[PDB]
Amino acid sequence: GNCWLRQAKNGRCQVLYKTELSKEECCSTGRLSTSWTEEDVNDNTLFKWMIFNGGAPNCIPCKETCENVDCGPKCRMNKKNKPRCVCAPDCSNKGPVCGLDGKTYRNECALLKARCKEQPELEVQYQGRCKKTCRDVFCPGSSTCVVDQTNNAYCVTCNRICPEPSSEQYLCGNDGVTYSSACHLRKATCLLGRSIGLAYEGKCIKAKSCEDIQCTGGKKCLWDFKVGRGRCSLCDELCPDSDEPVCASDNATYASECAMKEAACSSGVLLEVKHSGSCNSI
Amino acid sequence: GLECDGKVNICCKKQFFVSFKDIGWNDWIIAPSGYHANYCEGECPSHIAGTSGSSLSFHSTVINHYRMRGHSPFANLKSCCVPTKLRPMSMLYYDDGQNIIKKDIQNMIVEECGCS
């Protein structure tokens, strides 16, 4: 008859690929979920069906027993014996660990159970409940800790493969420090293990005010009496409309990033996000 | 949807692991290092392209039903097997400012393939 690869949520064979093809023929294999049509009807009665129904009616479920089944890490039957291969993380070989996703896990199989379902790109990252500050971490052998924009800890192999060029391979550290190469910053950033910031383009000078500071890319410098330096930011971005309300360094609360870009931009000075939500003393 | 296992020869999605080194985003991506992005590959024939299950099915069907009788600018545009569902992936990089940003890039990888 006919041969399919999937039975729908609601039954009905779907995903046909071998027509004119007896059952025990299409049923021999160990790859499960493979179901069966018993009738030949190549005409668009077939097309029809995908509409009228989840699909092909009178589907036939090859195995109702993990008989000759096959599936990368194992089978378990259960319910209306609808044997579904699931998750055989295989345990043995300690910890209550963190996740490369940022989420915490009570332990590793914990995770291996998850890496099974969706993300196989799901890593580990390091042992122990996940952290929001480089406070901790041995980082597997050789992998500097660092911190996200949300201020969170991650471990990594700093890439040390890339030093020197160039007209202006040559840029200014938000920490002062003239860096020689775009990737070079990346390096000292990583070594420092925290966002430093491209203060702006070119070699650094001591100036005392934004005017003085050039700026291409059409960014617009802004200053910060904090350390006393300039900063070549980008204000050409708008929003008037996800979201979030935050409270900032100067002693004020706002709306989105969007909210106070031109806060600083349109006005003067650079600002930093004190914290999310509001903050106040009544 | 699909699983490109066995001697399959249709629009199945073959697993594939991409190294940022191997392409050179090594440097502007922090981790994750590499990862699987896979893709779509296989012949896109007849009584099967509308059977795909994929989003692109019914339409694809209502199309071929044309070139079947070599009609307009159609007899010579083959249904090629493509992606029809892609979940996003969260990573880590230097935004244009060289700061450190964790975001989830949408449809960075392929859930299902389909005929078209």
Partner: peptide, 10 residues
């Protein structure tokens, strides 16, 4: 105490 290098967006 600590710090908080400015940002891009969210």
């Amino acid at each position: 105490a600590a710090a908080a290098a400015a940002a891009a967006a969210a």
